[PDB]
Amino acid sequence: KKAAATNMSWQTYVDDHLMCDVAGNRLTAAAILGQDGSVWAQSNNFPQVKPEEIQGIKDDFTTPGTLAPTGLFLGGNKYMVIQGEPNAVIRGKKGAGGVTIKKTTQALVFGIYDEPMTPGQCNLVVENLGEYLIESG
User: At 64, which CATH number?
Assistant: 3.30.450.30
State the DSSP H helix or E strand holding residue 41, giving kind and residue range, or none if neither: strand 39-42
Partners of 79 in the beta sheet? Answer: 72
Tell whether the torsion through CA atoms of 51, 57, 61 and 65 is positive or negative: positive
CB 61 within 8 A of CB 74: no
Determination technique used? X-ray
Peptide bond into 116 cis (omega under 30): yes
Which letter does DSSP use for residue 48 in this model?
Answer: P
- Contact call for residues 112 and 124 (beta carbons, < 8 A): no
Q: Resolution of the coordinates in A?
A: 3.6
Spatial separation of the C-alpha atoms in residues 75 and 22, rounded to whole Å = 26
Q: What is the DSSP string of 69-130?
A: HH-EEETTEEEEEEEEETTTEEEEEETTEEEEEEE-SSEEEEEEE-TTS-HHHHHHHHHHHH
Q: Which amino acid is at 15?
A: D
Cross-strand pairs, 34: 107
Number of independent structural domains in the chain:
1
85 - beta bridge partners?
A: 89
Question: How many angstroms separate the CA atoms of 115 and 31, rounded?
Answer: 19
* Other beta carbons within 10 Å of 135: 9
Length of the chain: 137
CA 8 from chain centre, in angstroms, equals 18
Cβ-based neighbours of 23, under 8 Å, separated by 6 or more: 121
Q: What's the domain range around 122?
A: 1-137
